[PDB]
Amino acid sequence: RYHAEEVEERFGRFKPGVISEELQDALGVTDKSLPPFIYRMRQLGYPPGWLKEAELENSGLALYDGKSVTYDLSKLVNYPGFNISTPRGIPDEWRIFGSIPMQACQQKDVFANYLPIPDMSKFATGITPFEFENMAESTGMYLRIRSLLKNSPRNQQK
Amino acid sequence: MPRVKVQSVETVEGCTHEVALPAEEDYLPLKPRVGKAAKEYPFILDAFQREAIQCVDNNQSVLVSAHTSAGKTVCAEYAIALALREKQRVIFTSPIKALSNQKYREMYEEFQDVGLMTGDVTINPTASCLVMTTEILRSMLYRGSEVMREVAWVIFDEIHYMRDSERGVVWEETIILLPDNVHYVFLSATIPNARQFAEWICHLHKQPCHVIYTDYRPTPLQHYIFPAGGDGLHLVVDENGDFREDNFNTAMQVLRDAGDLGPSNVFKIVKMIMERNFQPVIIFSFSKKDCEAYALQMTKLDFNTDEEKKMVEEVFSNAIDCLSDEDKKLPQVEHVLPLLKRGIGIHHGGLLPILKETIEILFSEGLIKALFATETFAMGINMPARTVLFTNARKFDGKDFRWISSGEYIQMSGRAGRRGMDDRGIVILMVDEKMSPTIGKQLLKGSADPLNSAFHLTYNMVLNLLRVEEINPEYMLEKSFYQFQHYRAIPGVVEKVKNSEEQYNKIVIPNEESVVIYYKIRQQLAKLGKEIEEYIHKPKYCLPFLQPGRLVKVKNEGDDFGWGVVVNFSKKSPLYVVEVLLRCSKESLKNSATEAAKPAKPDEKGEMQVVPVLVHLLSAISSVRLYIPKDLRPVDNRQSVLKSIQEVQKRFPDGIPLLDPIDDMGIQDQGLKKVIQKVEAFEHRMYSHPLHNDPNLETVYTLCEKKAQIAIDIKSAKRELKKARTVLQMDELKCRKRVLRRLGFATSSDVIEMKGRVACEISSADELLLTEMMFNGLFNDLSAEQATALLSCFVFQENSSEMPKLTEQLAGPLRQMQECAKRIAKVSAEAKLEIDEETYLSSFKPHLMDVVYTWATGATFAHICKMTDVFEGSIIRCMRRLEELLRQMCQAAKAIGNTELENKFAEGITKIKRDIVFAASLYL
Amino acid sequence: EADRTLFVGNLETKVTEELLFELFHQAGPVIKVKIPKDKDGKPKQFAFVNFKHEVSVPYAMNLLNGIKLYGRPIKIQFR
RNA sequence: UUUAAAAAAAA
């Protein structure tokens, strides 16, 4: 169902880019040291997994009367030390595990910019006459609602 | 018998104005306007509207039939203005409740001297104008409320809804019972048989009735087809109406090539629309789940600017503020807001009513630019769009699945193309693999369906009519636009029989006795051959002979495909299907997705395709088994098989041998022996006849056959004509009256007894069950909760498979109700009434009994909504219906003077009526 | 599915669904991790992970192979 | 170094 957006709670939830202290414990490295994967990551490049998410495909359908793919630049992931400059207090530990200093192409800016009938009285005989029920009055809600969007796209186009 | 004259009044181009008036009357021209016009409009009026206004200026009924958005409502507005100007009273009637609310808002903002009367609410009842659903009007008529006296005009809306087949009857009743002095105004979508309706009104009230028919629409339409698999839209129909055959054929060929070989097609279509500047779009899908899923898929676009987002947030918050804060915490309300923010909306019966109203308002104001709706939104008022898209052209009506009728397609597509702002409406139809070019052509080129009534008897109608005096149900049955159609048809059948008779007499035969004897003998031989073939086709005798090379002739009555080679056979489920390799027509082949098969036309050369025929169609199972290639996929091989069959035929110059049913198949049962004896005797008798050896007998035999055909046609036509000379449901009325008297409702003389008088009130659900249970004292002990739950069980009807378990209090009462229903079904059956007891008992679904009990206990709405699976919209609908039924039950208890039940139902109403379910509509 | 599946073997005992999902989601969207347990009630050395797109599966491997989790390398294999 | 498709609706 549309409102049943509980698929995102199979076991929990997380966010991209950020690093949790519990994750630091899991990896065996605290937060002071730069993550080791970053080394290999900056020796690999930008992950393609999130690339598809930020990529929008233009429909190729054409009108049979008788590609410059679009990317959402606001969805770019943040990977400090590879795409963004490493936060202060974290040196360029490229000598650990083997790596190189963050390159411009590895950096975020370069990658981003790269892209008869009976009478009525007879009827009412022997049966209870009809009575009005649920009598009520307008609360003016429609009036105020209409007042709110006084200048709407439809109205301004009128 | 009806006697009505249809004078075709001359009119300017665009409309066809014709008046049906009683035969003895003399047509006269309509007088021009007298005095100032009732109301003035800021824009010029197209011709047909002008003629309608002139017609209403003379207090003569009128039936406007034109495409919605052609501007029908202007006539109703003028009629209301005129009625108000003369201190009269008028009534506006609409089918649906929500449409009634919208119309009421429009009218109130127009004149401000307006009321409203529906089951849910009533506003300003003592108003010179009223808006009410048909049911309220029918209640007024049956109970003869004094308010009905002052009325002079009645404006029926969406009268084409009269063929609803469930709520259609309520129209006819209302039309029949009104006094003659009143004048009508009927607004309907374009329909072919409007003249019949006007004639019915004239004959029924004895006054002129006009008909204005116009197919003109303001902004043209262009119809494109999207095949499932293709990569483009083909302009199948242009605004000029010239159905482009070549483009349609190309689209269907692409469909076929894909079949025989943006993850979602709808996503591609909507994206293309967005980038082509067709933003305001209505996507029609005939399933709630489909609409939900498609809306969810599109949660990655945004058609709205930030300012529109702020406006939408403001409007949605203001609309929702009425509900309690606990209601605002519902997942449904919370989760739709993002969609509206980005410019996507949903509209189907499942949703909550308040959300539906809010989405309607937003769409009317243009904030939402892509709305996924079911068929219901089509009937909405003043919610057009620049484009309309059909996902699936298959809907499940009350009966079963079917292709959408051309009428529904026209009705929905009429909601495409605004006035002035956009000058080209676009309608796009998606077609899947299970589509045929013939079906597509019929759907696109078809016209509106004819208006055929659906009148059917109801116990409430019978009881009420019996109660009142100086009238009986026979009157209604006679005048209910159903006998009327048969009377209109009678002249056709009369002329048909007369013409057939005169032509049959015209035929000339040299000596009919001998020719007739010969023909009878020939027919008897044909019947005996049919019996023998029936003997052969017993599966246990012929199946061993249906080998993958056998050479059998298959001849379905009328159409014979000639010889063809068997390929395979199987037991389908217990008939047997044999797959032969016949010559097909290359037309049935192209549209084989729906067609069955057709013999190859003699002129052209067939395709030699495999046809799955039924076993008994095998006219003759010859015995020459061909050498089959063993791989019949490539089209080259099957032509080789055709050549082989031609060679085999050339080898046997005088007919291929056929298996002898007696010794080859080894049939032993004596019946075949006797049939053989009979056929031998008849053959000898035929040969010994003289005319058999005579020459030129072929033409004489042909004309004798045609004479016999015409004779049987005359017999059938006159039989059915005599059949049509009687009222149909009269037997049904007799059965209903028998049932009513058998249960004490009506005396043997057909005078309503107190039981029937009580049963008169209840009209929202079954009456006999409720009245019997009330009298049998079932309710005397149940607490308000159990009674409420049972009544809910009455008013629920939906395809639900949950079958929940009911623990203690919701079971026993249900079992007692089951016993009473079984008693009623048995009594009906013994009175010779068509009724299936099991189905009747299955109608009362208690699926919501537990839900309603919990809700009455005091549970919050979110709690119950999670207690089952039915969409919250259905729960709200059932709850409202149950509330009105409870009010009627209170009235019945008052009638029988049993204060206990009155108090119990008062408690029930008080408990189950609170914030969200009975949320006052924001249109008021 | 099989294209988007990827077996994980020799994972540390405390390695549960939450930590693996946290590790694997950062590189790209991942459907979920399957750990059919043995008759012990604790995570096995064997398990599987299913990603949203198979194109993401190699990159994770390209980025992760025998990484030091809980001071213990974890191997990853294909179908 | 690897476990069933199913719409719409009311006194």
From Swiss-Prot, chain A:
* Superkingdom to which the source organism belongs: Eukaryota
Effect of substituting F123K: Does not alter RNA helicase activity of NEXT complex
Q: Where is this region: RBM7 binding?
A: 14-27, 37-52
Record annotation: effect of changing D119A: Does not alter RNA helicase activity of NEXT complex
Give me the Gene Ontology terms describing cellular component: catalytic step 2 spliceosome; nuclear body; nucleoplasm; nucleus; TRAMP complex
Q: What drives induction of this protein's expression? A: Slight accumulation in cells entering S phase of the cell cycle.
**GO MF entry, a single one:** RNA binding
Keyword DNA repair belongs to the record: no
Q: Which UniProt keywords apply?
A: Acetylation, Coiled coil, Disease variant, Isopeptide bond, Metal-binding, mRNA processing, mRNA splicing, Nucleus, Phosphoprotein, Spliceosome, Ubl conjugation, Zinc, Zinc-finger
Q: State the compartments where it is located.
A: Nucleus, Nucleoplasm; Nucleus
Q: What is the effect of changing L149E?
A: Loss of RNA helicase activity of NEXT complex
Entry keyword annotation includes Ubl conjugation:
yes
What residue spans carry the region label MTREX binding? 116-158
Q: Which residues carry this modification: Phosphoserine?
A: S152
One biological process term from GO is:
snRNA catabolic process
Its function, per the record, reads: Scaffolding subunit of the trimeric nuclear exosome targeting (NEXT) complex that is involved in the surveillance and turnover of aberrant transcripts and non-coding RNAs. NEXT functions as an RNA exosome cofactor that directs a subset of non-coding short-lived RNAs for exosomal degradation. May be involved in pre-mRNA splicing. It is required for 3'-end maturation of telomerase RNA component (TERC), TERC 3'-end targeting to the nuclear RNA exosome, and for telomerase function.
Quote the disease note of the record.
Answer: Pulmonary fibrosis, and/or bone marrow failure syndrome, telomere-related, 5: A disease associated with shortened telomeres. Pulmonary fibrosis is the most common manifestation. Other manifestations include aplastic anemia due to bone marrow failure, hepatic fibrosis, and increased cancer risk, particularly myelodysplastic syndrome and acute myeloid leukemia. Phenotype, age at onset, and severity are determined by telomere length. PFBMFT5 inheritance is autosomal dominant.
Domain comment quoted from the record: The C-terminal part (659-707) contributes to MTREX RNA helicase activity, in part, by enhancing its RNA-dependent ATPase activity.
Swiss-Prot record, chain B:
Q: Which reaction does it catalyse?
A: ATP + H2O = ADP + phosphate + H(+)
This entry's Enzyme Commission designation comes to 3.6.4.13
Annotated GO biological processes are: DNA damage response; maturation of 5.8S rRNA; mRNA splicing, via spliceosome; RNA catabolic process; rRNA processing; snRNA catabolic process
List the subcellular locations: Nucleus, Nucleoplasm; Nucleus, Nucleolus; Nucleus; Nucleus speckle
* Helicase C-terminal domain span: 297-469
Cross-link position per record: Glycyl lysine isopeptide (Lys-Gly) (interchain with G-Cter in SUMO2) = K605
Q: Which family does it belong to?
A: Belongs to the helicase family. SKI2 subfamily.
Under what name is this protein listed?
Answer: Exosome RNA helicase MTR4
Q: Which organism is it from?
A: Homo sapiens (Human)
What is the name of the gene encoding this protein? MTREX
UniProtKB/Swiss-Prot annotation, chain C:
Tissue-level expression: Ubiquitous.
Tell me what the record says results from L19E: Impaired interaction with ZCCHC8
Domain named RRM is located at: 4-79
Region described as ZCCHC8 binding: spans on this chain: 19-29, 53-70
Modified after translation how?
This phosphorylation mediates YWHAE and YWHAZ interactions.
Localization recorded for this chain is:
Nucleus, Nucleoplasm; Nucleus
Q: Specify the effect of L63E.
A: Reduced interaction with ZCCHC8, and impaired interaction with SF3B2/SAP145
Q: What does this protein do?
A: RNA-binding subunit of the trimeric nuclear exosome targeting (NEXT) complex, a complex that functions as an RNA exosome cofactor that directs a subset of non-coding short-lived RNAs for exosomal degradation. NEXT is involved in surveillance and turnover of aberrant transcripts and non-coding RNAs. Binds preferentially polyuridine sequences and associates with newly synthesized RNAs, including pre-mRNAs and short-lived exosome substrates such as promoter upstream transcripts (PROMPTs), enhancer RNAs (eRNAs), and 3'-extended products from small nuclear RNAs (snRNAs).
Q: What is known of its domains?
A: The RRM domain mediates RNA binding; the RNA must have four nucleotides for efficient binding. Mediates the interaction of NEXT complex with promoter upstream transcripts (PROMPTs) and potentially aberrant forms of other non coding RNAs, such as snRNAs. The RRM domain exhibits specificity for polyuridine sequences.
Q: How does it assemble?
A: Component of the nuclear exosome targeting (NEXT) complex composed of MTREX, ZCCHC8, and RBM7 that directs a subset of non-coding short-lived RNAs for exosomal degradation. Interacts with ZCCHC8 and SF3B2/SAP145. Binds to MTREX through ZCCHC8. Interacts with YWHAE and YWHAZ; these interactions are stress-dependent and RBM7 phosphorylation dependent; release RNA from the NEXT complex and may affect RNA targeting to the nuclear RNA exosomome for degradation.
Which protein, by its recorded name, is this?
Answer: RNA-binding protein 7
Query: Which organism was this protein described from?
Result: Homo sapiens
Q: Lineage from the top down? A: Eukaryota, Metazoa, Chordata, Craniata, Vertebrata
User: What's the gene?
Assistant: RBM7
